[PDB]
Ligand binder design. Structure first.
Ligand SMILES: Nc1ncnc2c1ncn2[C@@H]1O[C@H](COS(=O)(=O)NC(=O)c2ccccc2O)[C@@H](O)[C@H]1O
Length: 507
């Protein structure tokens, strides 16, 4: 509907032919995030959707509160297609604010709890957001206005600044709803319109526009490969604003099948063990550093963790020995997940042998996912060859939002997203992530982002550049189309200019 305006505002859409294929093969469906919630309330009304301390929401209550909060937002002047920044810890009112935004067609911009005002400020400008919503776990935290008082330049267009303090009951956390009669809220957005912006995972974060249809599709596929059912009890320890926690399979997957999410503000081992034993949790998603915390907690022996069935681990390199240790100590099926907020997610399978779950990051979600392992010159590589992992598919973005200069470098000519990861596809077509394309260079004690230097060098006539380190020292491989490179760089951080520099191939 609004795709005309969005394209003019920075959105890069799916190419018309690919979009039609994802329609006809039954990937993209016709439900927005909020219409999906309305149908979950239709099917699972009185089931508990979310639990946090002494607070809980059934699917019915979540729908009502969301409707009530959307009506509030509308009354305060928030409108459809507006971007609203959302920053929140792992608190239960976050689910009311997310679907409240979806109820009026507003678009969340999911900000990790922890991003300072320096990040919020750039995120707010790049997205042209009109609102900042900051959920706080306590009253001693910085409010939305507090963060905005730290901007380096005023942001007049960000006029909605509101903080929710999570309290001992939902009703007390949301007093602004008292003077509001719930509406009959009609959003005009279609499932192929932009639902939200995510942030990528170095420097200033880039905005990732995801549509309803493409995100709900990835969630449905993750629901299948994680094997979620309406009896699934999932512990949420990762930050709720993170793509992994949201959808892989995340809390939305649990909502999708009518299960129960159990929300912990804390990752501390004892707290999580207590919750697992108390609620008989069957699944949890972790990153390797949380798994290490857990496998080395002396509290381990002290709790009944027998209900545990499946542990997702993703987000960073998982050493096979630590994957092995997770299976043994916790006595679960390990499910490795190699995903990115930009799109593609890969899962190992529940019927995969332990060895597969120990050695690989599994298989793409969709049969329409395309994974290219590219050599240094862009050419596709065969099975068991390490190279640059690039991808394109029915839920993978085609451009970062309102970032045309970065987009020209982050996607191939034919539209493959360049993950920055290296690895290979093995005999079973399981992907194995071995490392990063450009690790940061450690020159005389300082850390430098190679892509940060390539970008400036691309503005020289530069046709291709790859910056790497030898000896600790910074070298710039150039493809045509030293003193002058550095001179030009000083023209625009001294400790980053190359120490040596022009070949034809190997980028
Ligand atoms: N199993 C893994 N083994 C090694 N490395 C991994 C990795 N999983 C991510 N990475 C690295 O993390 C980048 C993405 O970062 S992310 O936007 O935060 N999204 C996530 O981590 C994420 C994780 C699970 C599901 C959805 C997600 O979105 C990737 O490019 C790669 O470099």
């Amino acid at each position: 509907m609004f795709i005309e305006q969005d394209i003019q505002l920075g959105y890069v859409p799916f190419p018309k032919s690919r979009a039609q294929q994802y329609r006809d093969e039954g990937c993209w469906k016709s439900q927005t995030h909020f219409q999906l919630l309305a149908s979950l309330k239709d099917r699972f009304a009185q089931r508990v959707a979310v639990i946090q301390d002494d607070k809980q929401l059934t699917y019915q209550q979540l729908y009502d509160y969301a409707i009530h909060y959307g009506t509030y937002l509308k009354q305060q002047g928030i409108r459809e297609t507006d971007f609203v920044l959302l920053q929140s810890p792992n608190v239960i009112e976050v689910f009311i604010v997310i679907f409240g935004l979806y109820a009026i067609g507003a678009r969340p911009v999911f900000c990790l709890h922890g991003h300072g005002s320096y990040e919020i400020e750039n995120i707010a400008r790049q997205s042209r957001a009109v609102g900042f919503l900051k959920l706080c776990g306590s009253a001693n935290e910085s409010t939305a206005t507090d963060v905005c008082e730290e901007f380096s330049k005023p942001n007049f267009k960000l006029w909605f600044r509101e903080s929710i303090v999570s309290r001992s009951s939902i009703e007390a956390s949301l007093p602004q709803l008292q003077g509001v009669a719930p509406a009959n809220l009609r959003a005009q957005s279609e499932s192929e319109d932009i639902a939200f912006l995510q942030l990528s995972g170095t420097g200033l974060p880039k905005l990732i526009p995801r549509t309803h249809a493409d995100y709900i599709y990835s969630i449905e596929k993750s629901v299948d490969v994680a094997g979620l059912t309406q009896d699934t009890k999932q512990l949420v320890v990762l930050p709720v604003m993170h793509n992994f926690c949201m959808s892989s399979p995340g809390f939305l997957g649990v909502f999708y099948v009518g299960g129960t999410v159990v929300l912990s503000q804390l990752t501390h081992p004892r707290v999580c063990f207590e919750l697992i034993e108390k609620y008989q949790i069957q699944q949890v998603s972790l990153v390797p550093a949380i798994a290490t915390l857990w496998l080395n907690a002396e509290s381990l022996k002290d709790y009944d963790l027998s209900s545990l069935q499946v542990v997702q681990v993703g987000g960073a390199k998982l050493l096979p020995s630590l994957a092995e240790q997770i299976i043994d100590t916790l006595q679960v099926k390990l499910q490795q997940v190699y995903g990115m907020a930009e799109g593609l997610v890969n899962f190992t399978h529940l019927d995969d042998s332990d060895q597969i779950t120990i050695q690989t990051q599994g298989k793409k979600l969709s049969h329409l996912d395309e994974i290219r392992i590219a050599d240094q010159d862009g050419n596709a590589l065969p099975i068991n060859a390490i190279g640059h992992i690039q991808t394109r598919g029915p839920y993978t973005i085609n451009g970062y939002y309102n970032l045309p200069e970065i987009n020209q470098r982050a996607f191939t000519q034919d539209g493959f997203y360049k993950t920055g990861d290296i690895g290979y596809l093995d005999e079973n077509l399981n992907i194995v992530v071995t490392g990063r394309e450009k690790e940061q260079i450690n020159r005389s004690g300082e850390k430098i982002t190679p892509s940060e230097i390539e970008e400036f060098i691309l503005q020289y006539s530069v046709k291709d550049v790859c910056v790497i380190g030898v000896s600790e020292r910074i070298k710039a491989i150039i493809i045509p189309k030293l003193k002058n490179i550095r001179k030009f760089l000083i023209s625009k951080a001294h400790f980053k200019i190359p120490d040596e520099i022009v070949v034809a191939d190997f980028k």
